[PDB]
């Protein structure tokens, strides 16, 4: 359906978008991006060091409960 000129323009525009994104990726890194990475590290800390120790203390209680039986 599309004409040859439309296809050529689509190719060239996709190429321009990719080239522009590459040139943006080659731009100097600001302090805001580093702050974003620092906040990513900060969020990860809270996500990993979250308390999930009930899944251990419940078992220890159960071990004792059944150890009393044994």
């Amino acid at each position: 359906q599309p004409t040859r000129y439309q296809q050529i323009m689509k190719r060239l525009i996709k190429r321009y978008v990719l080239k522009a994104q590459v040139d943006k990726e080659n731009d100097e890194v600001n302090e805001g991006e580093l702050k974003e990475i620092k906040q990513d590290i900060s969020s990860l800390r809270y996500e990993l060091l979250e308390d999930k120790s009930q899944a251990t203390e419940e078992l220890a209680i159960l071990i004792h409960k059944l150890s009393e039986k044994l």
Partner: nanobody
Amino acid sequence: LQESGGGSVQSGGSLRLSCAASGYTYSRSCLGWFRQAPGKERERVATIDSDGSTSYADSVKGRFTISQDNAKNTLYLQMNSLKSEDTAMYYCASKYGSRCQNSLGYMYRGQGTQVTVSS
């Protein structure tokens, strides 16, 4: 540190405890109160994390409230509707990490407070 608030109260009343335990913010510390009932074994009453998140035992859910001062230098336990079950030598403990809701690793380091409930 010395646990305070020791005394006797009638069943269904209220009482307050205090422990000179230094909490930390940003530093992943755990504070909590523990119950050593005579005849029974030591158990966990309530714990408070560095972020202020509190975990209560199923027995004391909704009835107790673990808190601390703004400077997180003193541990406060508030008890409401103290039934006959809630009778023990309420010690005070402090460990490191996010393993607040696991009673292993706590360093009690205290004389303990004696509380009894009359029926």
